Design a protein around this nucleic acid. Structure first.
Ligand SMILES: Nc1ncnc2c1ncn2[C@@H]1O[C@H](COP(=O)(O)OP(=O)(O)OP(=O)(O)O)[C@@H](O)[C@H]1O
Ligand SMILES: Nc1nc2c(ncn2[C@@H]2O[C@H](COP(=O)(O)O)[C@@H](O)[C@H]2O)c(=O)[nH]1
Ligand SMILES: [Mn+2]
Ligand SMILES: [Mn+2]
Length: 1095
DNA sequence: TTCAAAAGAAGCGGAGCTTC
């Protein structure tokens, strides 16, 4: 332990003594960090990092010598070098701002003078940077090595941070803003997804700063300094970037968005560089210079990414050997630029891509205000994807002469839910624009004979890309549908693309040609199909046509089907057999495919089925209120309004209701995953309000090109067949909007009751400003809830099965109860340790605990089995990072602002997370992991969670392997996995030790509404104990069903399109039998197996 | 309570209560 003398040798002039027991000023930088045994950063020991690194970046020869490497990235050329010269100059500016800010801090309130006199300002939330200063006459100055190294981290962050930010959804923004998710204003989520919160910006900056400092954290130093010092530096750097206008700070006032909300929230946006800035072609030169092992970089050729040791953002969870093997396999795959698509994108140009695939140039006064907001976000996503792709292309272009011959690898990690996620915001897995330009799929096809198998595969790929639902029809029927499309509507587009593949030119009306030809089939993959078909047409050697066009084997209603197979625990029923067949589990039909099923047996998938069940429940609901005209009229008005604006719901002249599967897709999925009905009602209303906002733009538009237009024709012209027929729709819209906002249903002791809101919609419509706000949105939602969502939920249960709903309920309760205990005991053991740290004279409140202390607290919870293990995957449902444990500020900037809360890795309540964790995890998660590692694992694919892109040469075998992987995952038993963990928990939990709030939480899950109130510790214990028995019985049931199923002849085509089902070769033949006969036969096997064990 | 990542700001004082 001469570590102390080692770190002191490197920073001998930092102020204070490196001893926690010392009397005067103590230096918590030297106490917190040690020199690594193996160098991590090349700036350690450098007296002037900015000068030294700038020198390294000044030429290829110097860079190579600095990095001690023979060759540098070819993208590091003349123009790029000049740009880095300028950025290094800017680094000096950031350093200069930081020095002045420090000088100001020291002078204000005589802090520097007081610090010199011995007041421990270096332990204040705003003074932790005083641990990296040095005495300078009558004042203090930054240690230049630590300062300039941090600035280097700031520069790299500035260059690439936006490229690595998380995507924000409604849930995120609702949590950030404290505004109800259903009541979020238009474009608010968009504004927030665009910027970074304080925590978001500072934590990412702090991470980079600490890595560039290249030291190791002392396990026995308080986290208030190990995390606090680099966070304090990051806050100062962020503040300097605001001063320099590299970052824009926007403090969003929630009170203008909701008068009762008092939150004011900072949003930080990095000023984007020019799209044609040479630095975009190689934005990681600093990182690759400073770090011995850079995280941020592209991987070309045989430079292969390392395999992540721990689950993404769950450092307590190691990736299993099987998971690591899968990660390795996916990281081995070579991706290649498809030159024709890049050239097509380039020739169209960003502006026309936006016009075609985004919203083009917005005319802010031909658009409803809310609609305009939505359009901007649309443009944002496309434009960012476009810019990111071409930055990547510019770097690839430097690697060699032929850009299509440069292999590209991508890093992956395993997420909390067991999915293999490609790292990065804009990569082939996550961005559709990029997916069609950089592909691992490649094949050489013989297309000289349109009767070849190769041509059939080619056709399949084209058809799927052109939005023909290829899994619903046989290959032969598909072919005819594709042919008539190509020779019909698409022909003018194909002609244009033939020309492009000849001369390299597009007509000035290219966007109109594509838009008209494609219509609703328009997508990036559709453009690939047009490109590839036209390339085939002009190909000189059709016998050896090279194309990356792919076929996606995609899971049919994957999540719900997986849940039904994995977590249904009872006897077999005929309804389950029919419904599971909708997802590709065929019993007693050797070699049956999904294409055959859909075309000859059952054209309705699981979502359509639930939709038909919804119509039954809606009819049932009407009957119960048959004589109640106000209620009948209220229901009619809701269905009327949805019919006006939604595609998936249509009503006829006689009130005949017709619904499409699309309206049930999301609600069915999230219902299984524990979503409440109110959230679903909010999403449905949002779909409606979006469409009317859009239709309002149409008003503004049609009114512009014709002032004389009637409001009826201005709003419903496009949708009607006549003048008078249009005022009928307008009258409907007005009647519906009035009755749905002025009157709401409420459930009173089981019965539906209509009440006046007193806040009904009144006034002439102003198309530009028109906004459905607060009280009116809530009204629509309450109507949607009781008259649509609630019948839908009934239909959902009837479709997936009451038995599954029961299993998911037991799973949720068990994992929630366990997470509550983990969280509460963690917090208790923290506040215990803090109470004895108060006895320590060396300890100050704000220092918090050491890592070793937190490790010991975490390890103490091990007997409560926080981890769920399957044998090939590990799940940590309660795992999180929250500010609630420490409940204190970690650091501020030197202006007493940018107050970063102290966040700690700790268990938190699971809520309903247990359901999707296990279902996604042991379902599609396990399938993909199996697909990557199984014998004869498909090569050269791109896996996207429940779908897999396959090159045209291998569609048959890869699809059969995918269906085999499905069958393998269906041998899983996630309830048994949860049971094993929960039973260990039950053996060791002490419910009496829990805080009253924790006990209340558990009572919600373990007890009914009635017997909570005054429940004893013992009551809650017995109830938690009952859930264990429930899980045990479910688990045994699931295990039996899977064994019995494996005995029978099965054809599995859940990963559908190609028509290559996996056959399990079960010996018991259940062909020529109805589902009823099959169910009886399976139940005979079930009982017999149940006796094999009761013995 | 769907899941895949969290997440108010700022004066005064030197933590943490307070007000917007
Ligand atoms: N909004 C969501 N919330 C939670 N999980 C989701 C959500 N969307 C998709 N998933 C998960 O990803 C899976 C794949 O989604 P996908 O878009 O392929 O739809 P799907 O449910 O398979 O239906 P289909 O593919 O037949 O249209 C889902 O089954 C579900 O498990
Ligand atoms: N868990 C989860 N997965 C999603 C969600 N949205 C999309 N996905 C996954 O991402 C896929 C979308 O891929 P793409 O739409 O780019 O073709 C879906 O099929 C599904 O696997 C979501 O909200 N939650
Ligand atoms: Mn799917
Ligand atoms: Mn999919």
């Amino acid at each position: 332990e001469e570590l102390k003398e080692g770190i002191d040798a490197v920073y001998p002039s930092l102020v204070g003594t490196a001893d926690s027991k010392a009397e005067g000023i103590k230096n918590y930088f030297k106490l917190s960090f040690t020199l690594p045994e193996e160098q991590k950063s090349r700036t350690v020991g450098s007296e002037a990092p900015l000068k030294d690194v700038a020198q390294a970046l000044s030429s290829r020869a110097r860079y190579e010598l600095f990095t001690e490497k023979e060759t540098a990235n070819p993208a590091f050329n003349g123009e790029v070098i000049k740009r880095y010269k300028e950025l290094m100059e800017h680094g000096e500016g950031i350093a200069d701002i930081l020095r002045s800010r420090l000088a100001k801090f020291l002078n204000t309130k005589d802090v520097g003078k007081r610090f010199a006199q011995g007041t421990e300002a270096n332990r204040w939330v705003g003074g932790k940077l005083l641990n990296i200063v040095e005495q300078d006459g009558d004042t203090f100055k930054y240690n230049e090595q630590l300062l300039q190294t941090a600035v280097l981290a700031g520069l790299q962050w500035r260059l690439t941070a936006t490229s690595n930010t998380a995507i924000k959804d409604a849930k995120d923004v609702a949590a950030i803003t404290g505004i109800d998710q259903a009541l979020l204003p238009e474009g608010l989520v968009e504004q927030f997804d665009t910027g970074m919160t304080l925590t978001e910006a500072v934590s990412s900056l702090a991470q980079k700063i600490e890595s560039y400092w290249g030291l190791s954290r002392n396990p026995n130093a308080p986290l208030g300094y190990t995390k606090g010092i680099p966070t304090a530096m990051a806050a100062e750097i962020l503040a300097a970037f605001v001063e320099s206008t590299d970052v824009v700070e926007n403090i969003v006032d929630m009170s203008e968005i909701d008068p009762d909300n008092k939150k004011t929230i900072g949003l930080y946006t990095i000023t984007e560089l020019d799209s044609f800035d040479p630095i975009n072609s190689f934005p990681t030169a600093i990182e690759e210079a400073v770090l011995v092992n850079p995280t941020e970089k592209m991987f070309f050729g045989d430079d292969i990414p390392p395999v992540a040791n721990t689950q993404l953002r769950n450092p307590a969870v190691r990736n299993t050997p099987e998971q690591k093997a899968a990660l390795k396999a996916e990281q081995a795959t070579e991706f290649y630029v498809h030159t024709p698509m890049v050239q097509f994108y380039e020739t169209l140009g960003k502006d026309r891509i936006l016009e075609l695939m985004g919203a083009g140039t917005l005319n802010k006064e031909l658009l409803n205000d809310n609609h305009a907001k939505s359009l901007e976000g649309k443009n944002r996503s496309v434009e960012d994807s476009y810019n990111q792709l071409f930055s990547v292309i510019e770097q690839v272009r430097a690697q060699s002469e032929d850009i299509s011959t440069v292999p590209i690898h991508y890093a992956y990690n395993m997420t909390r839910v067991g999915r293999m996620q490609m790292l990065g915001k804009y990569n082939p897995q996550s961005a559709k624009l990029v997916r069609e330009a950089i592909l691992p799929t490649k094949a050489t096809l013989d297309l000289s004979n349109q009767n070849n198998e190769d041509f059939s595969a080619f056709q399949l790929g084209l058809a799927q890309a052109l939005d023909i639902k290829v899994h619903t029809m046989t290959r032969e029927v598909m072919s005819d549908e594709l042919t008539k499309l190509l020779e019909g509507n698409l022909k003018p587009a194909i002609d244009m693309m033939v020309e492009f593949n000849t001369t390299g030119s597009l007509p000035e009306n290219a966007v109109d040609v594509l838009n008209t030809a494609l219509g609703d089939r328009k997508s990036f993959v559709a453009l690939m199909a047009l490109m590839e078909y036209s390339r085939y047409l002009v190909a000189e050697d059709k016998s050896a046509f090279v194309t990356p066009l792919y076929v996606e084997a995609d899971g049919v209603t994957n999540g719900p089907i997986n849940a039904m197979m994995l977590m249904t625990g009872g006897l077999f029923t005929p309804d389950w057999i029919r419904n599971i067949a909708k997802g590709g589990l065929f019993i007693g039909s050797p070699n049956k495919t999904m294409n055959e099923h859909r075309s000859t047996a059952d054209n309705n998938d699981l979502y359509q089925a639930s939709t038909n069940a919804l119509m039954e429940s809606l009819g049932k609901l009407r009957s119960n209120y048959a004589s109640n005209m106000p209620i009948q009229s209220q229901i009619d008005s809701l269905l009327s309004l949805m019919d006006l604006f939604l595609p998936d719901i249509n009503l006829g002249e006689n009130g005949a209701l017709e619904l499409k599967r699309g309206i049930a897709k999301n609600p069915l999925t999230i219902t299984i995953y524990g979503s409440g009905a109110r959230g679903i009602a909010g999403k449905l209303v949002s779909s409606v309000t979006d469409a009317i906002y859009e239709r309002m733009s149409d008003v503004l538009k049609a009114r512009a090109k014709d002032p004389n237009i009637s409001a009826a024709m201005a709003m419903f012209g496009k949708q009607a067949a006549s003048e008078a027929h249009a005022e009928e729709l307008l009258a409907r819209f007005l009647k519906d909007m009035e009755t749905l906002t002025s009157t709401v249903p409420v459930k009173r002791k089981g019965v539906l009751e209509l009440q006046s809101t007193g806040t009904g919609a009144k006034g002439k419509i102003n198309p530009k400003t028109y906004t459905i706000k607060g009280e009116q949105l809530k009204a629509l939602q309450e109507n949607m809830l009781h008259f649509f969502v609630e019948p839908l939920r009934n239909g959902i249960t009837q479709t997936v099965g009451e038995s599954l709903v029961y299993s998911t309920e037991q799973l949720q309760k068990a994992t929630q109860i366990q997470s509550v205990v983990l969280e509460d005991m963690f917090k208790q053991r923290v506040q215990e340790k803090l109470a004895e740290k108060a006895k320590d004279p060396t300890w100050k409140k704000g220092d918090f605990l050491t890592q070793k202390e937190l490790n010991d607290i975490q390890a103490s919870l091990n007997n409560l089995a926080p981890m769920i293990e399957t044998g090939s995957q590990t799940f940590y449902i309660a795992g999180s990072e929250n500010a609630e444990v420490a409940n204190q500020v970690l650091a501020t900037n030197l202006d007493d602002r940018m107050r970063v809360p102290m966040s700690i890795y700790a268990p938190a309540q699971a809520g309903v997370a247990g359901i999707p964790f296990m279902t996604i995890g042991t379902g599609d998660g396990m399938m993909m992991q199996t697909l990557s590692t199984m014998k004869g694992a498909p090569k050269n694919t791109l896996k996207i969670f429940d779908g897999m892109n396959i090159g045209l040469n291998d569609i048959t075998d890869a699809s059969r392997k995918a269906n085999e992987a499905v069958y393998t995952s269906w041998q899983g038993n996630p309830i048994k996995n949860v049971y094993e963990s929960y039973a260990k928990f039950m053996k060791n939990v002490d419910f009496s030790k829990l805080s009253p709030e924790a006990l209340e939480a558990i009572g919600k899950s373990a007890l009914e509404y009635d017997q909570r109130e005054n429940a004893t510790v013992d009551d809650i214990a017995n109830a938690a104990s009952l859930i264990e028995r429930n899980l045990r019985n479910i688990a045994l049931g699931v295990d039996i069903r899977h064994k019995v199923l494996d005995k029978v002849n099965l054809s599995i085509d859940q990963m559908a399109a190609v028509g290559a089902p996996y056959q399990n070769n079960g010996k018991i033949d259940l062909s020529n039998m109805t589902p009823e006969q099959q169910a009886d036969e399976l139940n005979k096997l079930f009982r017999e197996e149940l006796e094999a064990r009761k013995q």
